[PDB]
């Protein structure tokens, strides 16, 4: 029950949970481009010149 002292420890192993692999996909997923505005189909002159 004396509990004598011991020598100096050489190395200290650190145990830790691993990096989060297979979380990010190898291609990227962007928000798609909002489309450029279209001229709508079915546009015709509705105004006739009077008389």
């Amino acid at each position: 029950g004396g509990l004598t002292c011991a020598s100096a420890p050489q190395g200290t192993l650190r145990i830790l949970e691993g990096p989060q692999q297979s979380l990010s996909g190898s291609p990227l997923q962007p928000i798609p481009a909002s489309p450029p505005p279209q001229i709508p189909p079915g546009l015709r002159p509705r105004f006739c010149a009077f008389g």
């Binding site: 505005p37 709508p40 546009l43 509705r46 105004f47 010149a49 009077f50």
Partner: protein, 63 residues
């Protein structure tokens, strides 16, 4: 005002027969000076004018 930050003050209520009527039959409703533009550079009132004219002629509402 407009929605492009361009105040006017109402100066003269011009009688309707004196207004410059167009070739379609229309009188205007508000006359706006071309000398409010070049120091203020609101291109957006030009595109809004073309855009609202072309939206009132088609039944559309333009983005």
């Amino acid at each position: 005002a407009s929605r492009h930050g361009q105040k006017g003050i109402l100066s003269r209520l011009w009688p309707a027969e004196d207004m410059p009527f167009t070739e379609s039959g229309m009188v205007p409703d508000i006359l706006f000076n071309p000398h409010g533009f070049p120091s203020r550079m609101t291109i957006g009132m030009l595109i809004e004018s073309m855009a609202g004219k072309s939206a009132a002629l088609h039944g559309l509402c333009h983005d």
